Design a protein around this nucleic acid. Structure first.
Lengths: 50, 149
DNA sequence: ACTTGGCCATGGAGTCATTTTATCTTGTGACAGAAAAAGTATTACTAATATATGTTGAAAA
DNA sequence: TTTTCAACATATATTAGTAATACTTTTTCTGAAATGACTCCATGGCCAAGT
């Protein structure tokens, strides 16, 4: 049990789940910032990497 | 027909147009011959063709015949002023104050400024400093200068 | 003379609000929009330069 | 075709004239527990008119 899945895995997994996933969520929430002006503009995020 | 129903529907406006208070039911009061969409399709197009005229007040919507100078005038104007200039020329004698346009038009100040500058160069508007405090610069049609003192 | 109504004052009563709740530690840690003033950037000059940039292109390899 | 030249142009800081226009900055100028009170009600009593 402890050998492969480690003693202190709580702080690891949640982190390793964060960087590998919830970033690709947060930006998927707000991927477009657009002012009110110049009706042609947009700023479209796509991917996040660390 | 675009031209026929345009010219004969312009005829009731140029003749009477039931004053300012004319509503769409008042069109059926005069011409009820037109089917629902037939009269409304050419309504919409003649506003797109700037021939009929609409006013937003009371119940239903008011209508009047275009002077055709204001027609091509606003057609020359941008989409900003297209409502904004028309929205302001509906302010009538007392005009309107700038910053309250944003809550009405849902725009910045920066975006409404430059077109107001155009209408200044276009001379269809003028800054009016009235009895109330001169932080306002309320705007009315340059065509008139009415006020309360 | 003798009863009622209304009336105003007062007593309860169920209403809402202020300040405590232990030492010794011992690190730690100003709005904006506008006006006006003021000021500078241009846009013509020669004009000596020496880089840069390019493009192109022409000529050589 | 590539590389060479090279040439060819073109800004480039200097200096004043301008004068004029434009364009930005600046500097103002105002749209848990337990008492405290608090009100909300109910009666006592007093003053009065019909009796």
């Amino acid at each position: 049990f402890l050998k492969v899945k480690g003693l202190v895995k709580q702080h690891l997994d949640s982190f390793n789940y964060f960087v590998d996933t919830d970033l690709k969520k947060i930006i998927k929430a707000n991927q477009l910032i657009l002012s009110d002006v110049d009706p042609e503009f947009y700023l479209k995020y796509v991917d996040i990497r660390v | 027909q675009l031209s026929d129903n345009a010219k004969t529907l312009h005829s009731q406006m140029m003749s009477k147009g039931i004053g300012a208070l004319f509503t769409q039911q008042e069109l059926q009061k005069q011409m009820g011959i037109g089917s629902l969409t037939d009269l409304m399709s050419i309504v919409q197009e003649l506003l797109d063709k700037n021939l009929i005229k609409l006013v937003k007040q009371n119940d239903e919507l008011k209508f009047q015949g275009v002077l055709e100078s204001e027609a091509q005038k606003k057609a020359t104007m941008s989409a900003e002023e297209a409502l904004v200039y028309s929205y302001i020329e509906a302010s009538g004698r007392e005009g309107i104050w700038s910053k309250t346009i944003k809550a009405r038009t849902n725009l910045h100040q920066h975006v409404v400024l430059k077109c107001l500058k155009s209408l200044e160069s276009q001379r269809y508007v003028k800054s009016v400093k009235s009895v109330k405090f001169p932080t306002r610069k309320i705007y009315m049609l340059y065509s008139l200068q009415p006020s309360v003192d």
